[PDB]
mmCIF file of all heavy atoms in Angstrom:
data_model
loop_
_atom_site.group_PDB
_atom_site.id
_atom_site.type_symbol
_atom_site.label_atom_id
_atom_site.label_comp_id
_atom_site.label_asym_id
_atom_site.label_seq_id
_atom_site.Cartn_x
_atom_site.Cartn_y
_atom_site.Cartn_z
ATOM 1 N N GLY R 280 91.040 -18.812 15.167
ATOM 2 C CA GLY R 280 92.004 -19.647 15.915
ATOM 3 C C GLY R 280 92.313 -20.943 15.231
ATOM 4 O O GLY R 280 93.484 -21.426 15.360
ATOM 5 N N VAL R 281 91.392 -21.552 14.526
ATOM 6 C CA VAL R 281 91.622 -22.837 13.867
ATOM 7 C C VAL R 281 92.343 -22.580 12.528
ATOM 8 O O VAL R 281 92.208 -21.507 11.962
ATOM 9 C CB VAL R 281 90.332 -23.627 13.714
ATOM 10 C CG1 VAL R 281 89.642 -23.780 15.053
ATOM 11 C CG2 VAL R 281 89.386 -22.931 12.746
ATOM 12 N N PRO R 282 93.166 -23.521 12.068
ATOM 13 C CA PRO R 282 93.838 -23.330 10.759
ATOM 14 C C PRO R 282 92.867 -23.405 9.616
ATOM 15 O O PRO R 282 91.734 -23.870 9.694
ATOM 16 C CB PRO R 282 94.856 -24.471 10.736
ATOM 17 C CG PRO R 282 95.054 -24.851 12.143
ATOM 18 C CD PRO R 282 93.732 -24.665 12.793
ATOM 19 N N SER R 283 93.364 -22.949 8.453
ATOM 20 C CA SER R 283 92.539 -22.811 7.257
ATOM 21 C C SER R 283 92.404 -24.092 6.454
ATOM 22 O O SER R 283 91.864 -24.085 5.364
ATOM 23 C CB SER R 283 93.048 -21.693 6.364
ATOM 24 O OG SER R 283 92.535 -21.821 5.043
ATOM 25 N N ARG R 284 92.920 -25.234 6.985
ATOM 26 C CA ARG R 284 92.747 -26.492 6.266
ATOM 27 C C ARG R 284 91.320 -27.006 6.451
ATOM 28 O O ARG R 284 90.838 -27.776 5.613
ATOM 29 C CB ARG R 284 93.762 -27.527 6.748
ATOM 30 C CG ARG R 284 93.720 -27.806 8.225
ATOM 31 C CD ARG R 284 94.726 -28.881 8.605
ATOM 32 N NE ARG R 284 94.743 -29.170 10.022
ATOM 33 C CZ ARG R 284 95.529 -28.558 10.913
ATOM 34 N NH1 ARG R 284 96.370 -27.591 10.507
ATOM 35 N NH2 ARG R 284 95.466 -28.888 12.213
ATOM 36 N N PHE R 285 90.643 -26.599 7.507
ATOM 37 C CA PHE R 285 89.258 -26.994 7.734
ATOM 38 C C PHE R 285 88.344 -26.261 6.763
ATOM 39 O O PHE R 285 88.458 -25.055 6.580
ATOM 40 C CB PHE R 285 88.834 -26.686 9.167
ATOM 41 C CG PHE R 285 89.633 -27.410 10.211
ATOM 42 C CD1 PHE R 285 90.714 -26.792 10.826
ATOM 43 C CD2 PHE R 285 89.275 -28.675 10.606
ATOM 44 C CE1 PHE R 285 91.443 -27.433 11.779
ATOM 45 C CE2 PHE R 285 90.026 -29.359 11.565
ATOM 46 C CZ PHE R 285 91.090 -28.723 12.166
ATOM 47 N N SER R 286 87.407 -26.989 6.153
ATOM 48 C CA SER R 286 86.472 -26.393 5.228
ATOM 49 C C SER R 286 85.219 -27.243 5.154
ATOM 50 O O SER R 286 85.254 -28.465 5.245
ATOM 51 C CB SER R 286 87.098 -26.259 3.841
ATOM 52 O OG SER R 286 88.038 -25.198 3.799
ATOM 53 N N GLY R 287 84.090 -26.562 4.993
ATOM 54 C CA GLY R 287 82.814 -27.231 4.781
ATOM 55 C C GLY R 287 82.167 -26.666 3.545
ATOM 56 O O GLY R 287 82.525 -25.565 3.084
ATOM 57 N N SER R 288 81.264 -27.423 2.997
ATOM 58 C CA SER R 288 80.553 -27.003 1.771
ATOM 59 C C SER R 288 79.150 -27.580 1.789
ATOM 60 O O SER R 288 78.772 -28.329 2.706
ATOM 61 C CB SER R 288 81.311 -27.447 0.523
ATOM 62 O OG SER R 288 82.576 -26.812 0.420
ATOM 63 N N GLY R 289 78.357 -27.219 0.781
ATOM 64 C CA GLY R 289 77.019 -27.728 0.684
ATOM 65 C C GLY R 289 75.973 -26.788 1.262
ATOM 66 O O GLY R 289 76.305 -25.922 2.081
ATOM 67 N N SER R 290 74.725 -26.942 0.834
ATOM 68 C CA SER R 290 73.609 -26.194 1.353
ATOM 69 C C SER R 290 72.366 -27.060 1.263
ATOM 70 O O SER R 290 72.414 -28.193 0.794
ATOM 71 C CB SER R 290 73.414 -24.882 0.625
ATOM 72 O OG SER R 290 74.524 -24.022 0.814
ATOM 73 N N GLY R 291 71.231 -26.510 1.711
ATOM 74 C CA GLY R 291 70.003 -27.250 1.617
ATOM 75 C C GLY R 291 69.852 -28.313 2.699
ATOM 76 O O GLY R 291 69.799 -27.964 3.892
ATOM 77 N N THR R 292 69.811 -29.571 2.309
ATOM 78 C CA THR R 292 69.540 -30.641 3.281
ATOM 79 C C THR R 292 70.783 -31.415 3.652
ATOM 80 O O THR R 292 70.862 -31.920 4.765
ATOM 81 C CB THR R 292 68.466 -31.580 2.732
ATOM 82 O OG1 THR R 292 68.964 -32.234 1.575
ATOM 83 C CG2 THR R 292 67.203 -30.815 2.385
ATOM 84 N N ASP R 293 71.740 -31.544 2.755
ATOM 85 C CA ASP R 293 72.933 -32.354 2.991
ATOM 86 C C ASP R 293 74.151 -31.436 3.166
ATOM 87 O O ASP R 293 74.264 -30.421 2.476
ATOM 88 C CB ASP R 293 73.167 -33.327 1.834
ATOM 89 C CG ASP R 293 74.448 -34.141 2.001
ATOM 90 O OD1 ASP R 293 74.780 -34.515 3.130
ATOM 91 O OD2 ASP R 293 75.129 -34.403 0.976
ATOM 92 N N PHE R 294 75.036 -31.814 4.110
ATOM 93 C CA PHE R 294 76.209 -31.020 4.422
ATOM 94 C C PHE R 294 77.436 -31.915 4.523
ATOM 95 O O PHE R 294 77.352 -33.072 4.922
ATOM 96 C CB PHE R 294 76.021 -30.263 5.726
ATOM 97 C CG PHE R 294 74.932 -29.255 5.680
ATOM 98 C CD1 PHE R 294 73.648 -29.576 6.061
ATOM 99 C CD2 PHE R 294 75.172 -27.964 5.262
ATOM 100 C CE1 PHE R 294 72.628 -28.665 5.999
ATOM 101 C CE2 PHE R 294 74.156 -27.037 5.213
ATOM 102 C CZ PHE R 294 72.882 -27.379 5.588
ATOM 103 N N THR R 295 78.588 -31.373 4.147
ATOM 104 C CA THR R 295 79.851 -32.102 4.161
ATOM 105 C C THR R 295 80.908 -31.362 4.977
ATOM 106 O O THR R 295 80.896 -30.116 4.997
ATOM 107 C CB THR R 295 80.415 -32.327 2.758
ATOM 108 O OG1 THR R 295 80.723 -31.061 2.163
ATOM 109 C CG2 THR R 295 79.423 -33.064 1.868
ATOM 110 N N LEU R 296 81.748 -32.115 5.657
ATOM 111 C CA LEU R 296 82.889 -31.592 6.395
ATOM 112 C C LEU R 296 84.120 -32.359 5.964
ATOM 113 O O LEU R 296 84.168 -33.590 6.082
ATOM 114 C CB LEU R 296 82.696 -31.705 7.904
ATOM 115 C CG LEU R 296 83.878 -31.219 8.736
ATOM 116 C CD1 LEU R 296 84.102 -29.726 8.540
ATOM 117 C CD2 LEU R 296 83.713 -31.563 10.209
ATOM 118 N N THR R 297 85.145 -31.654 5.499
ATOM 119 C CA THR R 297 86.353 -32.289 4.994
ATOM 120 C C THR R 297 87.615 -31.583 5.490
ATOM 121 O O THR R 297 87.627 -30.385 5.737
ATOM 122 C CB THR R 297 86.369 -32.372 3.453
ATOM 123 O OG1 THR R 297 87.518 -33.053 3.020
ATOM 124 C CG2 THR R 297 86.330 -30.963 2.818
ATOM 125 N N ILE R 298 88.659 -32.367 5.693
ATOM 126 C CA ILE R 298 90.018 -31.899 5.993
ATOM 127 C C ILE R 298 90.925 -32.552 4.989
ATOM 128 O O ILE R 298 90.917 -33.763 4.828
ATOM 129 C CB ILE R 298 90.429 -32.251 7.428
ATOM 130 C CG1 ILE R 298 89.522 -31.587 8.472
ATOM 131 C CG2 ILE R 298 91.871 -31.819 7.670
ATOM 132 C CD1 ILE R 298 88.425 -32.485 9.000
ATOM 133 N N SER R 299 91.724 -31.726 4.295
ATOM 134 C CA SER R 299 92.597 -32.278 3.259
ATOM 135 C C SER R 299 93.744 -33.045 3.858
ATOM 136 O O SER R 299 94.012 -34.196 3.497
ATOM 137 C CB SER R 299 93.109 -31.148 2.372
ATOM 138 O OG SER R 299 93.974 -31.657 1.351
ATOM 139 N N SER R 300 94.443 -32.433 4.836
ATOM 140 C CA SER R 300 95.566 -33.097 5.470
ATOM 141 C C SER R 300 95.224 -33.308 6.941
ATOM 142 O O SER R 300 95.167 -32.344 7.719
ATOM 143 C CB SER R 300 96.850 -32.261 5.337
ATOM 144 O OG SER R 300 96.723 -31.035 6.035
ATOM 145 N N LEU R 301 95.005 -34.558 7.318
ATOM 146 C CA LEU R 301 94.671 -34.880 8.704
ATOM 147 C C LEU R 301 95.907 -34.756 9.591
ATOM 148 O O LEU R 301 97.043 -34.957 9.145
ATOM 149 C CB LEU R 301 94.092 -36.287 8.797
ATOM 150 C CG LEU R 301 92.595 -36.397 8.410
ATOM 151 C CD1 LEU R 301 92.165 -37.842 8.290
ATOM 152 C CD2 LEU R 301 91.770 -35.676 9.429
ATOM 153 N N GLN R 302 95.668 -34.440 10.841
ATOM 154 C CA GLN R 302 96.733 -34.206 11.824
ATOM 155 C C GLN R 302 96.574 -35.097 13.009
ATOM 156 O O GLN R 302 95.476 -35.607 13.292
ATOM 157 C CB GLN R 302 96.709 -32.720 12.236
ATOM 158 C CG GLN R 302 97.116 -31.764 11.128
ATOM 159 C CD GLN R 302 98.090 -30.695 11.590
ATOM 160 O OE1 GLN R 302 98.437 -30.669 12.784
ATOM 161 N NE2 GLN R 302 98.487 -29.845 10.681
ATOM 162 N N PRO R 303 97.674 -35.351 13.761
ATOM 163 C CA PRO R 303 97.540 -36.224 14.964
ATOM 164 C C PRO R 303 96.713 -35.600 16.110
ATOM 165 O O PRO R 303 96.314 -36.333 17.019
ATOM 166 C CB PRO R 303 98.987 -36.452 15.371
ATOM 167 C CG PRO R 303 99.760 -36.262 14.137
ATOM 168 C CD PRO R 303 99.052 -35.191 13.385
ATOM 169 N N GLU R 304 96.485 -34.285 16.090
ATOM 170 C CA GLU R 304 95.615 -33.691 17.105
ATOM 171 C C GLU R 304 94.150 -33.813 16.723
ATOM 172 O O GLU R 304 93.284 -33.582 17.578
ATOM 173 C CB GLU R 304 95.978 -32.232 17.336
ATOM 174 C CG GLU R 304 95.525 -31.306 16.239
ATOM 175 C CD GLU R 304 95.858 -29.853 16.516
ATOM 176 O OE1 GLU R 304 96.503 -29.585 17.555
ATOM 177 O OE2 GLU R 304 95.486 -28.973 15.719
ATOM 178 N N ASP R 305 93.842 -34.149 15.479
ATOM 179 C CA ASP R 305 92.468 -34.140 15.016
ATOM 180 C C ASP R 305 91.759 -35.494 15.236
ATOM 181 O O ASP R 305 90.663 -35.676 14.763
ATOM 182 C CB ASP R 305 92.407 -33.766 13.535
ATOM 183 C CG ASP R 305 92.402 -32.275 13.306
ATOM 184 O OD1 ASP R 305 92.867 -31.557 14.224
ATOM 185 O OD2 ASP R 305 91.929 -31.841 12.249
ATOM 186 N N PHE R 306 92.421 -36.414 15.934
ATOM 187 C CA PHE R 306 91.801 -37.716 16.188
ATOM 188 C C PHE R 306 90.794 -37.554 17.280
ATOM 189 O O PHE R 306 91.113 -37.673 18.491
ATOM 190 C CB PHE R 306 92.865 -38.759 16.532
ATOM 191 C CG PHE R 306 93.704 -39.179 15.368
ATOM 192 C CD1 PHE R 306 95.069 -39.000 15.369
ATOM 193 C CD2 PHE R 306 93.087 -39.766 14.273
ATOM 194 C CE1 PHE R 306 95.855 -39.397 14.294
ATOM 195 C CE2 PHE R 306 93.868 -40.166 13.184
ATOM 196 C CZ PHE R 306 95.214 -39.960 13.197
ATOM 197 N N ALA R 307 89.537 -37.299 16.912
ATOM 198 C CA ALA R 307 88.438 -37.064 17.829
ATOM 199 C C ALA R 307 87.092 -37.296 17.128
ATOM 200 O O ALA R 307 87.084 -37.684 15.947
ATOM 201 C CB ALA R 307 88.494 -35.658 18.403
ATOM 202 N N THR R 308 85.997 -37.057 17.806
ATOM 203 C CA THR R 308 84.683 -37.213 17.182
ATOM 204 C C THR R 308 84.160 -35.858 16.720
ATOM 205 O O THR R 308 84.588 -34.788 17.217
ATOM 206 C CB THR R 308 83.671 -37.890 18.132
ATOM 207 O OG1 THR R 308 82.456 -38.076 17.446
ATOM 208 C CG2 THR R 308 83.463 -37.049 19.360
ATOM 209 N N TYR R 309 83.237 -35.882 15.758
ATOM 210 C CA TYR R 309 82.691 -34.663 15.165
ATOM 211 C C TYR R 309 81.181 -34.700 15.172
ATOM 212 O O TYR R 309 80.571 -35.669 14.728
ATOM 213 C CB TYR R 309 83.220 -34.495 13.732
ATOM 214 C CG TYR R 309 84.682 -34.130 13.665
ATOM 215 C CD1 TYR R 309 85.658 -35.104 13.575
ATOM 216 C CD2 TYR R 309 85.100 -32.797 13.670
ATOM 217 C CE1 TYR R 309 87.004 -34.769 13.517
ATOM 218 C CE2 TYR R 309 86.436 -32.462 13.604
ATOM 219 C CZ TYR R 309 87.375 -33.458 13.515
ATOM 220 O OH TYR R 309 88.701 -33.118 13.461
ATOM 221 N N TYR R 310 80.577 -33.604 15.635
ATOM 222 C CA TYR R 310 79.128 -33.484 15.746
ATOM 223 C C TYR R 310 78.603 -32.389 14.838
ATOM 224 O O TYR R 310 79.226 -31.338 14.687
ATOM 225 C CB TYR R 310 78.707 -33.189 17.190
ATOM 226 C CG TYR R 310 78.940 -34.325 18.153
ATOM 227 C CD1 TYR R 310 80.068 -34.365 18.929
ATOM 228 C CD2 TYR R 310 77.967 -35.312 18.327
ATOM 229 C CE1 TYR R 310 80.271 -35.372 19.839
ATOM 230 C CE2 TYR R 310 78.175 -36.349 19.231
ATOM 231 C CZ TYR R 310 79.334 -36.374 19.989
ATOM 232 O OH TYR R 310 79.544 -37.386 20.881
ATOM 233 N N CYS R 311 77.426 -32.619 14.262
ATOM 234 C CA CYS R 311 76.662 -31.606 13.573
ATOM 235 C C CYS R 311 75.852 -30.861 14.613
ATOM 236 O O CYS R 311 75.744 -31.281 15.746
ATOM 237 C CB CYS R 311 75.690 -32.187 12.562
ATOM 238 S SG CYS R 311 76.415 -33.176 11.258
ATOM 239 N N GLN R 312 75.295 -29.720 14.221
ATOM 240 C CA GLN R 312 74.266 -29.031 14.995
ATOM 241 C C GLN R 312 73.414 -28.177 14.046
ATOM 242 O O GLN R 312 73.946 -27.335 13.333
ATOM 243 C CB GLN R 312 74.896 -28.134 16.062
ATOM 244 C CG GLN R 312 73.860 -27.398 16.902
ATOM 245 C CD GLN R 312 74.488 -26.377 17.824
ATOM 246 O OE1 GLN R 312 75.584 -26.557 18.326
ATOM 247 N NE2 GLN R 312 73.795 -25.265 18.024
ATOM 248 N N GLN R 313 72.111 -28.425 14.041
ATOM 249 C CA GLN R 313 71.222 -27.615 13.239
ATOM 250 C C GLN R 313 70.865 -26.361 14.023
ATOM 251 O O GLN R 313 70.933 -26.367 15.261
ATOM 252 C CB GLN R 313 69.945 -28.380 12.857
ATOM 253 C CG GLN R 313 68.918 -28.643 13.955
ATOM 254 C CD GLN R 313 67.886 -27.550 14.113
ATOM 255 O OE1 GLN R 313 67.642 -26.766 13.195
ATOM 256 N NE2 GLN R 313 67.273 -27.462 15.307
ATOM 257 N N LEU R 314 70.503 -25.301 13.309
ATOM 258 C CA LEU R 314 70.144 -24.040 13.923
ATOM 259 C C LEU R 314 68.990 -23.371 13.242
ATOM 260 O O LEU R 314 68.959 -22.133 13.121
ATOM 261 C CB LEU R 314 71.351 -23.114 13.961
ATOM 262 C CG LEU R 314 72.300 -23.353 15.103
ATOM 263 C CD1 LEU R 314 73.504 -22.443 14.971
ATOM 264 C CD2 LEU R 314 71.633 -23.157 16.428
ATOM 265 N N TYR R 315 67.997 -24.120 12.750
ATOM 266 C CA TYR R 315 66.863 -23.496 12.060
ATOM 267 C C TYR R 315 65.946 -22.808 13.062
ATOM 268 O O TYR R 315 65.687 -21.612 12.941
ATOM 269 C CB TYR R 315 66.101 -24.510 11.215
ATOM 270 C CG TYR R 315 65.173 -23.880 10.201
ATOM 271 C CD1 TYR R 315 65.631 -22.885 9.360
ATOM 272 C CD2 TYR R 315 63.857 -24.275 10.111
ATOM 273 C CE1 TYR R 315 64.775 -22.305 8.419
ATOM 274 C CE2 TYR R 315 62.995 -23.714 9.199
ATOM 275 C CZ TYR R 315 63.485 -22.728 8.339
ATOM 276 O OH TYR R 315 62.642 -22.158 7.427
ATOM 277 N N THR R 316 65.444 -23.559 14.048
ATOM 278 C CA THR R 316 64.576 -22.963 15.069
ATOM 279 C C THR R 316 64.668 -23.835 16.323
ATOM 280 O O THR R 316 65.238 -24.915 16.342
ATOM 281 C CB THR R 316 63.131 -22.861 14.589
ATOM 282 O OG1 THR R 316 62.382 -22.060 15.518
ATOM 283 C CG2 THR R 316 62.478 -24.240 14.494
ATOM 284 N N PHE R 317 64.122 -23.285 17.393
ATOM 285 C CA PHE R 317 63.950 -24.055 18.634
ATOM 286 C C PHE R 317 62.970 -25.186 18.388
ATOM 287 O O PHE R 317 61.960 -24.978 17.702
ATOM 288 C CB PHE R 317 63.442 -23.195 19.773
ATOM 289 C CG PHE R 317 64.463 -22.254 20.364
ATOM 290 C CD1 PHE R 317 64.732 -21.031 19.743
ATOM 291 C CD2 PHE R 317 65.152 -22.579 21.505
ATOM 292 C CE1 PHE R 317 65.705 -20.179 20.282
ATOM 293 C CE2 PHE R 317 66.109 -21.714 22.044
ATOM 294 C CZ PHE R 317 66.374 -20.515 21.433
ATOM 295 N N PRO R 318 63.205 -26.399 18.911
ATOM 296 C CA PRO R 318 64.312 -26.853 19.751
ATOM 297 C C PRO R 318 65.562 -27.242 18.987
ATOM 298 O O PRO R 318 65.460 -27.889 17.931
ATOM 299 C CB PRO R 318 63.724 -28.072 20.469
ATOM 300 C CG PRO R 318 62.270 -28.094 20.103
ATOM 301 C CD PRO R 318 62.185 -27.443 18.780
ATOM 302 N N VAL R 319 66.710 -26.878 19.525
ATOM 303 C CA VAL R 319 67.996 -27.218 18.901
ATOM 304 C C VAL R 319 68.256 -28.706 19.078
ATOM 305 O O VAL R 319 67.987 -29.271 20.172
ATOM 306 C CB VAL R 319 69.113 -26.380 19.543
ATOM 307 C CG1 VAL R 319 70.447 -26.628 18.884
ATOM 308 C CG2 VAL R 319 68.746 -24.920 19.504
#
């Protein structure tokens, strides 16, 4: 459903989230979420 301009990269301990062309609908906050084990 989301467009293909969204992309993430990286592995291990550090992670990056980038958008090449920002849009007026994208003005919001962004949260990480780890998923290794409970507790999330």
